[PDB]
Design a protein around this ligand. Structure first.
Ligand SMILES: Nc1ncnc2c1ncn2[C@@H]1O[C@H](COP(=O)(O)OP(=O)(O)NP(=O)(O)O)[C@@H](O)[C@H]1O
Ligand SMILES: Nc1ncnc2c1ncn2[C@@H]1O[C@H](COP(=O)(O)OP(=O)(O)NP(=O)(O)O)[C@@H](O)[C@H]1O
Ligand SMILES: [Mg+2]
Ligand SMILES: [Mg+2]
Length: 1165
């Protein structure tokens, strides 16, 4: 394998326009990166002009106007540079990516079947088509532009810092690694603890998934409380892990706050020292500190670019490996002969095409097809010596081992290999349709034909009137994924696309779509009476296409057996808008649910406020220090700077303490809330009906994913998100108050430009995240078509529609190209306008500060303090606004959770108050006039007003046929599916009114395909009773003949078992389920087919265990029970739920059971 190619090789599909776009985007990214430190330098110059000229009001006003003009120039430069970078990079990346997808699909479909058998697999090719978005649509589309932009920012910030104040820049460059390593430690610890918590949540999801896959026994054996308790224990483990995670996150980010505040205290003291020694200015000091931080952040932000570049190198190496391979199929003449008789006879001296994956195996040894012209020849044989290899031979897949295949005295190997393809028709087992129009999915057989030939191609063969009468319309883009759910329409569309093709050398490889409907009847009229005759190796049915064919040509052991007469039989084993009032109500309900932890939240809230306030205070101090930088009194300057540094150290200590407090307590309340939510969701789902678990969207994997995702989503929505909202609200409040009390009418101006600043900063955050959306979703349709074409590469090569598929792929990928260009242009223009308005607002604020100072309304100190404090307030508001979409997502998860919780259940496992039940029952049950009881699929209605009787202390051994409601009478007994017309009376009264959980504690079951959950067989057996103890388990194991086999292993009771455990035999788990049913010790017992596939001694042991269970008390056994039913008084015999005579095993009345019950026994004997 290859670990990657050269980075430049990723640009192999860049034409002149792509080169121009890349150059323009690179220049724009470089200038946009350099602009921000240049703006810091210009801010330093403006502040120096605005503070150092306090006495000369005219000079400072003129210089402030000049530097506001420079701010406008920088804003325009950022506008142009960001527009260029974003739009050009996105467009060039999209163009190169689309060119690569087109070329890759063409190259892949141009290869032979060998390249997808022993070289790169079909799944690998589809995955490469998927991850072309990851490779080229990501790394060189925008990540390259971001890399250039951030490297430019880093270099420009370093240059600005080291040209303004090199002393302060050097000490700041020394400082930056401290914050970097503190943040790295915090991120590492947080990621590790989050991974551990995620593993705990995954284990909890495994627990709930195991609960719902085995819901049939969990509901029956009143194990819902046990499952809830186990889930709660797992959730408590995950909650302790989340507590550790929250404490670690709070401590780490409080350490970051403490370190940055202390470092700013040191840097501000050193800047005061530099101003005191007349080395530089205060504005220069602030700007050089900020510029070195911006350079450090820029250098840190180019790591994702390098990660994307490495991933791109490896994935481009893969894609180039597929593309650059020259197919061996086209190494032949490709132009030899294309003028042969349409009625051709394929001759095979020796069969070949031993697949290159396993060249040692020779499935086809030696035989000849010797097909008749105009007469249909069939083949049949075993699966191991299959017939599809003959199809591969005929279609010239170029794998000749020893012999050679030739058509009517002309070698296929030396043939054109182009004309042969349309000469040879094909309808394989797979329909192999494509995500394109139905007309195209037929037209691709003969491209030159118009709609008319398509019409008679779909008319002569099969019926196309379904398409005409299709509610979608005359033309259809194969619906969504496939036109037909059944597959008959798919097969007949394939037949029509072969009809536009030449059927001269037709090949029909049967149909694996389970067609046993009128689709086969229509197939009888399509390509079963066609005038010519060639290989039709249909083996779906014995008489289908074989009885009518004049040559059976049975194939076995890679050689043709007796051929010609079809009368002889062949031995084989073949079978034959959205209102937010509802969201607010849901949030209030969730908060009421989270009442017990409100106190904790409140403390965390307090911490948030403090931290919020702290930030403002810090900004204030910083701005205040700047005012002290421009002060003629040196001693007063030193005293004020030292006071501010000490206050800032105190702020750092408070920031650490209250950050740990806020985040620890907010994560504590979030963990408690998500644990409570998960527990309530589990209770709600376990309170539902069995039909609810039957539904597909409530599947086990679906349920686990839904629960985990919803809980995680709301957790964030309620934790760090609300933390940040409260913190930023406190910051904004404190900042506005400080600005207004210092110098109003300028804070009013900054509030006037407040929306501009918050919008521009939100767009800055978006740019940091990335402006290109979901790359895979953008090319979803083209990716789907490419994957379908790759999976059906055999059909594409057979119909010679490689060019048509590639052209359809270009037509599918053009709209994403146009959309990406337009999105890039809109994003670039919007981002540039936002930045220009931001810098215009900054210039306006500083000029208004100058105007207030010149008029004598205010002073420099108050103006600069208000300005900086309001700017940090705007930054906090930006954070809140950019976190709003997570609030939207959390509201969606919240309404999902509260629609799951508030769903009502028809059946109540834990009834509030019902008719009390005695400790021991009689066992008599009457299922009078029962019905199908299957809401999920009401198409079928079994139990046509059927009634069933079970006398107290007696057994029923009903047998029935397969799929006659055999395994559903017990479901009616346990109230899994409520019978609408059925009266199920237990102990003389209906089960609907007694305590359901109490009865389910008094009825045992041995389900068909026995449930083997848990980790140890000991717990599986103990599941039968709450007070399992040890004597009960031992006696149950002994009674059901389940003690010797378990003790055979050294582990015995404490043995690894379950879904992830060691797989054991069916008889062992059946007897384990029987032992669990016995240890349940129930008056009414329900059995199933516990003898599906067992050896002689295991069969005898299972029958003995069943005999003992029946001898115990009242029981219902529904197994086949061909003999030795222990003389049940009655046996219920039914035909699809209809009323029928109850033929007994002893055959007292040998009239009804003679033709039903005894027939299967005679057949098996
Ligand atoms: N790509 C492959 N690599 C290796 N062995 C293969 C491959 N494709 C098919 N086989 C083997 O080919 C043998 C014969 O089956 P084959 O004729 O290919 O298909 P089939 O589905 O059995 N045909 P049919 O009987 O007409 O339905 C089997 O033993 C397969 O394992
Ligand atoms: N999830 C389901 N949704 C709808 N119908 C179902 C579902 N599962 C089973 N059925 C049908 O409900 C009926 C139950 O037949 P029943 O004999 O009780 O079970 P079975 O497992 O089919 N028995 P058997 O064939 O003897 O092993 C049959 O018509 C089933 O096909
Ligand atoms: Mg086949
Ligand atoms: Mg069953």
């Amino acid at each position: 394998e290859i670990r990657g190619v050269a980075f430049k090789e990723l640009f192999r599909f860049a034409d002149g326009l792509d080169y121009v776009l890349m150059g323009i985007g690179s220049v724009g990214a470089f200038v946009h990166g350099c602009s921000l430190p240049l703006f810091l330098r210009f801010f330093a110059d403006l502040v120096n002009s605005f503070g150092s000229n306090s006495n000369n009001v005219e000079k400072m006003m003129e210089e402030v106007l000049k530097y506001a003009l420079y701010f406008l120039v920088v804003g325009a430069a950022i506008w142009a540079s960001s527009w260029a970078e974003i739009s050009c990079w996105m467009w060039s990346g999209e163009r190169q990516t689309t060119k690569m997808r087109i070329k890759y699909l063409e190259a892949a479909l141009n290869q032979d079947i060998q390249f997808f058998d022993t070289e790169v697999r079909t799944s690998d090719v589809v995955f490469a088509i998927n991850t072309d978005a990851v490779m080229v649509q990501d790394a060189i589309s925008e990540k390259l532009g971001n890399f250039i932009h951030y490297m430019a920012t880093f270099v420009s910030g370093f240059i600005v810092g080291f040209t303004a104040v090199w002393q302060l820049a050097l000490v700041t460059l020394a400082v930056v690694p401290l914050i970097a390593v503190i943040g790295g430690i915090h991120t590492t610890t947080l990621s590790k603890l989050s991974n551990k918590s995620q593993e705990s949540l995954s284990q909890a999801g495994n627990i709930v998934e195991q609960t719902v896959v085995q819901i049939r026994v969990v509901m029956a054996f009143v194990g819902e409380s046990r499952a809830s308790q186990a889930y709660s224990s797992a959730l408590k483990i995950a909650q302790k892990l989340g507590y550790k995670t929250g404490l670690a996150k709070g401590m780490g980010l409080g350490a970051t706050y403490f370190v940055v505040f202390c470092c700013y205290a040191l840097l501000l003291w050193y800047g005061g020292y530099l101003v005191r020694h007349h080395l530089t200015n205060g504005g220069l000091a602030i700007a050089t500190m900020f510029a070195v931080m911006i350079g450090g952040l820029a250098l840190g932000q180019s790591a994702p670019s390098m990660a994307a570049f490495a991933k791109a190198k490896v994935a481009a190496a893969k894609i180039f490996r597929i593309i650059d391979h020259k197919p061996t199929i086209e190494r032949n003449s490709e132009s030899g002969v294309e003028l042969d008789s349409v009625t051709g006879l394929v001759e095979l001296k020796n069969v070949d095409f031993s697949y290159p994956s396993r060249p040692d195996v020779k499935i086809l040894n030696n035989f000849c097809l010797s097909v008749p012209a105009g007469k249909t020849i069939a083949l049949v044989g075993s699966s191991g010596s299959g017939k599809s290899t003959v199809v591969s031979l005929i279609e010239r897949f170029y794998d000749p081992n020893s012999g050679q295949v030739l058509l009517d005295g002309q070698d296929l190997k030396t043939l054109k290999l182009r004309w042969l393809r349309q000469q040879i028709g094909l309808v394989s087992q797979e329909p192999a349709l494509f995500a394109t129009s139905i007309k195209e999915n037929i037209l691709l057989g003969r491209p030159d034909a118009d709609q008319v030939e398509i019409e008679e191609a779909a008319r002569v063969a099969n019926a196309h009137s379904f398409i005409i009468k299709l509610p979608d319309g005359f033309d259809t883009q194969v619906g969504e994924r496939g036109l037909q759910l059944s597959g008959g329409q798919k097969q007949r569309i394939a037949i029509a696309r072969a009809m536009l093709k030449n059927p001269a050398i037709l090949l029909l490889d049967e149909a694996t779509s389970a067609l046993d409907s009128e689709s086969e009847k229509l197939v009888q009229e399509a390509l079963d009476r066609f005038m010519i005759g060639r290989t039709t190796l249909i083996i779906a049915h014995r008489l289908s296409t074989i009885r009518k064919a004049d040559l059976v040509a049975v194939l076995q052991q890679g050689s043709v057996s007796e051929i010609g007469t079809h009368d002889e039989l062949f031995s084989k084993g073949e079978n034959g808008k959205l209102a937010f009032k509802d969201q607010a109500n849901s949030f209030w309900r969730l908060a009421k649910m989270n009442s017990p932890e409100w106190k904790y939240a409140l403390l965390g809230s307090v911490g948030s406020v403090i931290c919020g306030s702290l930030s403002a205070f810090f900004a204030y101090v910083l701005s205040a220090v700047l005012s002290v930088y421009y002060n003629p009194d040196h001693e007063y300057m030193i005293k004020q700077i030292d006071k501010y540094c000490y206050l800032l150290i105190g702020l750092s200590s408070a920031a650490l303490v209250f950050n740990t407090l806020q985040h620890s307590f907010w994560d504590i309340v979030g963990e408690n809330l998500t644990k409570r939510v998960r527990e309530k969701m589990l209770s709600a789902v376990l309170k539902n009906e069995m039909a609810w678990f039957d539904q597909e969207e409530n599947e086990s994997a679906r349920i686990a994913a839904r629960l985990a995702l919803d809980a995680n989503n709301v957790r964030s929505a309620i934790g760090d998100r609300i933390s940040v909202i409260v913190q930023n609200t406190a910051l904004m409040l404190v900042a506005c108050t400080a600005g207004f009390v210092l110098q109003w009418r300028l804070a009013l101006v900054l509030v006037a430009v407040f929306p501009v600043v918050v919008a521009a900063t939100v767009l800055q955050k978006m740019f940091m995240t990335g402006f290109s959306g979901d790359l895979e979703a953008a090319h979803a349709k083209g990716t789907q078509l490419a994957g379908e074409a790759i999976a059906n590469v055999r059909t594409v090569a057979a119909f010679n529609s490689e060019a048509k598929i590639v052209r359809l792929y270009t037509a599918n990928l053009e709209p994403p190209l146009k959309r990406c260009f337009w999105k890039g242009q809109i994003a670039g223009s919007g981002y540039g306008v936002a930045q220009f308005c931001l810098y215009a607002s900054y210039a306006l604020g500083l000029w208004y500060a100058s105007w207030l100072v010149k008029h004598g309304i205010s002073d420099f100190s108050k103006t600069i303090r208000v300005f900086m404090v309001l700017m940090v307030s705007a930054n906090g508001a930006a954070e809140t606004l950019t976190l709003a979409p997570d609030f939207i997502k959390g509201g969606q998860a919240m309404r999902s959770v509260f629609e799951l919780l508030d769903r009502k259940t028809e059946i109540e496992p834990d009834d509030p108050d019902t008719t009390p039940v005695p400790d021991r029952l009689r066992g008599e049950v009457e299922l009078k006039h029962i019905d199908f009881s299957y809401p999920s699929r009401p198409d079928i209605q079994i139990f046509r007003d059927l009634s069933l009787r079970a006398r107290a202390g007696k057994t029923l051994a009903l047998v029935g046929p397969s799929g006659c409601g055999k395994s559903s009478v017990i479901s009616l007994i346990q109230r899994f599916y409520e019978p609408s017309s059925g009266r199920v009376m237990i102990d003389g009264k209906d089960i609907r009114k007694y305590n359901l959980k109490a009865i389910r504690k008094h009825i045992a079951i041995v389900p068909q395909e026995p449930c083997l959950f848990g980790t140890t067989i000991y717990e599986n057996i103990a599941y039968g009773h709450e007070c399992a103890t040890e004597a009960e388990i031992i006696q149950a194991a002994t009674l059901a003949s389940a003690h010797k086999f378990i003790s055979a292993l050294p582990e015995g009771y404490k043995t690894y078992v379950g879904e992830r455990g060691v797989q054991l035999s069916g008889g062992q788990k059946q007897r384990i389920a029987i032992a669990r049913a016995l240890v349940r010790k129930a008056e009414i017992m329900l059995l199933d087919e516990a003898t599906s596939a067992l050896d002689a001694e295991s069969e005898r042991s299972v029958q003995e265990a069943l005999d003992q269970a029946c001898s115990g008390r009242t029981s219902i056994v529904v197994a086949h029970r061909l003999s030795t039913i222990r003389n049940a008084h009655v046996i219920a015999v039914i035909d699809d739920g209809k009323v029928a005579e109850q033929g007994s095993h002893s055959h007292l009345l040998k009239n009804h059971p003679d033709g039903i019950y005894a027939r299967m026994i005679q057949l098996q004997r």
